[PDB]
Symmetry: D2
Subunit: 308 residues, 4 copies
């Protein structure tokens, strides 16, 4: 039940730190014949790297994709330590590659005729290492489509979103790289809420993978709706990256200058997004600000049907 990519599919590399949001992202990416996932690499944020790698293997096992090249990446942020303080996935059916993660990225990028899109959904540690170590491959990277950041209001500190906060230095390197970026930050993901009726649509999709996703969403309904945020349904974060790859017209986007703060007393990890063109600086990212929520749900339902 592996989905075969079209020859004309967008080649991508998925760099992720799964828990559960990432899991849904991987499930959506691997459901689409419009995408060609060349490899999965793992990052670490608030779980040990052994755990995120194991979780990636469990997700790939769920999807019967033991053929997917997978490698564990950096064990900690570039210049800081990890910040360590649900429903069950199947036990892994296979072992990961022992190959170094950015070596694996370079191999796939070098070998791909078509420039590759990097899709990180955790801290940007591995992406930064790749950018800094393989300058000759930048022309073979189409874009970096990342989940991270917030154009003003953080969810980890008042100024910073979690993925960026974990490794501000890595994020800084990404935004300075000159490679095209699409930033899917909290501004859009806060709007990507799943309602009860949306979960029931997903649960009605007649395959095991949809059942897994619906269970994850049930869990999010209970534990990802702290009333202080004022959510009606549970937001989905990481899957917004895949939705943008598949149907970018779902999104309100603007080309902006974005800087990552690495020096402030209170603001380390902030993405400073010049939405109102106050700085005069050249835009370095496509920043997503809103989405067609119903269209997003429709896309998820359509995607998961591929596993029927």
């Amino acid at each position: 039940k592996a989905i075969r990519p079209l020859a004309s599919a967008t080649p991508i590399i998925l760099d992720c730190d799964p828990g559960h949001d990432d899991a849904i992202s991987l499930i959506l990416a691997l459901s689409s014949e419009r995408l060609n996932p060349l490899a999965v690499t793992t990052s670490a944020g608030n779980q040990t790297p052994d755990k995120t790698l194991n979780n990636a293997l469990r997700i790939l096992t769920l999807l019967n994709r033991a053929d997917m090249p997978v490698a564990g990446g950096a064990v900690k942020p570039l210049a800081r330590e990890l910040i360590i303080a649900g429903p069950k996935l199947p036990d892994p059916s296979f072992d990961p590659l022992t190959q170094n993660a950015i070596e694996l990225m370079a191999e796939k990028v070098r070998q791909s005729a078509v420039p590759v899109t990097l899709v990180p959904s955790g801290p940007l540690t591995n992406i930064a290492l790749f950018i800094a170590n393989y300058p000759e491959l930048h022309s073979k990277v189409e874009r970096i489509v990342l989940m991270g950041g917030a154009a003003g209001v953080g969810n980890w500190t008042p100024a910073a979103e979690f993925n960026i906060f974990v490794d501000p230095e890595a994020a800084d390197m990404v935004f300075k790289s000159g490679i095209p970026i699409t930033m899917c930050g909290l501004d859009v993901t806060h709007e990507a809420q799943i309602m009860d009726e949306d979960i029931e649509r997903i649960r009605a999709i007649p395959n095991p993978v949809a059942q897994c996703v619906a269970e994850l969403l049930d869990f999010f309904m209970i534990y990802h709706r702290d009333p202080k945020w004022g959510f009606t349904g549970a937001p989905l974060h990481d899957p917004c990256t895949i939705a943008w790859l598949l149907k970018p017209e779902l999104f309100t986007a603007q080309e902006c200058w974005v800087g990552v703060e690495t020096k402030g007393e209170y603001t380390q990890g902030m993405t400073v997004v010049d939405r109102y063109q106050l700085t005069g600086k050249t835009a370095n990212a496509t920043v997503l600000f809103d989405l067609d929520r119903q269209g997003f749900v429709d896309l998820i339902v359509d995607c998961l049907s591929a596993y029927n």
Copy 2:
């Protein structure tokens, strides 16, 4: 036509850098028998201090209040230089006091039986100097009700509001002072929009002072509505401080920890507002987030009628 404060009025000191927003603030403050303005002191942000002092004198002349103690304050921010790059007020009918501005503040605060509310509407330079120099008077300061800051999105840099940006060090000292604060930032002032029909109500008030305010608003309609902000009407900033003094129930408020960033690469002048209680830090300000816009207009109309 001077408005006589009630014996039970709230004593205040108005510290301001007028241009035109401040002018409306002073006009509203001096219209109310519920407030007792003890002095006016001037700060400087994007005009020379000679100009802001002259403008304060012109406003007080408009209001026939040459009795008001007025003194020019600091000529520049504490640790930075000024950032220097409309309709007409009457020429001044009187000279300012030569007394030092924070000496004048201390005199009035020391002499007031009732603790005094400081009401800054420009950079916080003079307020910080007062706080640091007169620790023995902190118990005689009720509150600092300031226009400044933004809980995430600036209007001068992407992270910072103008008044705070001009003098982040001064602002930092204010927020660290332990004196109660009400912060009227861009979050609320962006909502305090004046519509065409609101201006026409004000213009219909049968006195010269209302005519002046309506002319200022006409000007704001043309030049303070850069379409990028997406305003329907022209926002009023500084007058929100006076509205909070007179009718705080117009506002949505929350007790928050607020820190001022003075060290970041991209974020100097940001007010970091912990609206979602992520830091565990004790609240040091009442932050205003929304207001009853129609109620705000009604208050302005009622206030200006005092000059009939």
Copy 3:
């Protein structure tokens, strides 16, 4: 036994946080008819402000100078808290002025025909407040002769000297002020060592004040010679300011650009001294780097004889 200043004496204001180094400084300043001390103001660093003020009163009592205007200054640094963690002076014979310290400074500076030299020997908190609050008096300040800083190697943190570290913001304001500065930092004070034979010369001076100084030096010999510093004798810090006022030819000096670091992770409170002209920035201080140690001792002995 008060020393009467010459009409042609250098007017000075002594701003200090005594413990014992400051005490010797005040004793030397008040011994010289070449200096005219207009007032003493107190700062606070690692003792409560009540203690430094009391100590100033005790020193002035020792010297039979209850006529000296004295006032306690700021109770804490501008943007930080105090860092709180010997032989006995006489009990105070008089009370301090209740006048605000920078108001007292302004009064004396305004009243002095001759521009006044400010001589701080503790954190620069009061000096910064004066500079920022009284811009119109800058032309009546000759120079600021301060004990503080180090051109590379701190004694409190690896990068910072104590006085600057206590209040980096205040120090920053001083060095940005445009008022001439002489910086007597650790580079020179480390060389200003008092040997056993020097103490015995001082002790032989036939008056009570010299006896007090010799006792202070005995104490320094025991407790101010941590072997890690590699001192042969006990350094005298604050008195180097007075020695520079009286006999500047004792010193090796160079005009340098100096910046105070207020933003770094590890370097807050550092004085960045461009001794090797690497920055291209205009010099803002006379920095002292070495002294004629024997000449310094000779000056002290000559000074203390004035109390005979």
Copy 4:
């Protein structure tokens, strides 16, 4: 005339940005049967990476070592741009490996039974990338012996030495890595001066390689003795790393905590060296503070004789 390492030699990797100091370092390293150079990798600081790689090839050609694995490294610092603004070496006789530089480092480190010493003499960019990307190899790195830093007084900015200043982020990562470090900073290299008579000793060594070194030193005598530094002879910087590997007893060393400043206004690139144990922090580097200069010259003369 290749020098064959002893089986018991110290394995090293030389990471360098040659101009001329590095050249002398490579010449000394490759002269010693006590060292086993596994590879040469190039960094870039104030010359384009094509130039430093070419220069490394020219040095290896001089030494008849076309067998040495050599690879060009990062083309720019991690989070900053390069800072771009003598006698002749032979034209290269061979091409470099096309292999990625940190992949080459990992290959040699993984293959070496004996833990390897990394010896950087330029910006620490490649070393940081290796540390962050290959955590599993840290136990196979004996030590990092680097030329860089200064315990208080910089040669590029007042606070920072050049190699660290070029890439403070990389340096920060090195000092945080937990791998043993020997820091050969300006404190020691300033003392490593070559006198006229020392050059003439070297020139008398009867082989072409010594003649080359003497010519480089002649050049240094003219252009590396800006009188502001107060040098008597021309300092040698990078070769101090090799001297420490061969004869560490030439040096005065102390175990210190060292932090790299990446956030300050004036102090970015500073190495903050806690020589006086003020911070309580655990030591992370052996810092060199002085050397036996004559012994250093004697070592150089003895080394260059290996090419006879």
